[PDB]
Amino acid sequence: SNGTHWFVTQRNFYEPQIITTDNTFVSGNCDVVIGIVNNTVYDPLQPEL
Amino acid sequence: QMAYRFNGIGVTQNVLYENQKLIANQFNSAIGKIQDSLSSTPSALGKLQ
């Protein structure tokens, strides 16, 4: 987090990128994990359609 | 860091986040048993002696 926005980067070098479906995977509800946060996950397909 | 180490052996990271309490309890119990394992057995430290 930049303080205002959320990104995803590699671990050994800073290179922020937008959180999309193509670089994340889904598993379960957002109540088991301790420390989860809310944000938008962008879907590339929908804007085209 | 523990999730990174789980990735290091071929297990995905959601396993740790969904079993965090169980894993911490197991670790604490094993550390608790080390004390007795050394103390009760008197021949553990033969190499140093």
UniProtKB/Swiss-Prot annotation, chain B:
Subunit of the fusion protein that is processed upon entry into the host cell. Mediates fusion of the virion and cellular membranes by functioning as a class I viral fusion protein. Contains a viral fusion peptide that is unmasked after S2 cleavage. This cleavage can occur at the cell membrane by host TMPRSS2 or during endocytosis by host CSTL. In either case, this triggers an extensive and irreversible conformational change that leads to fusion of the viral envelope with the cellular cytoplasmic membrane, releasing viral genomic RNA into the host cell cytoplasm. This is Spike protein S2'. It comes from Severe acute respiratory syndrome coronavirus 2 (2019-nCoV). The gene is S.
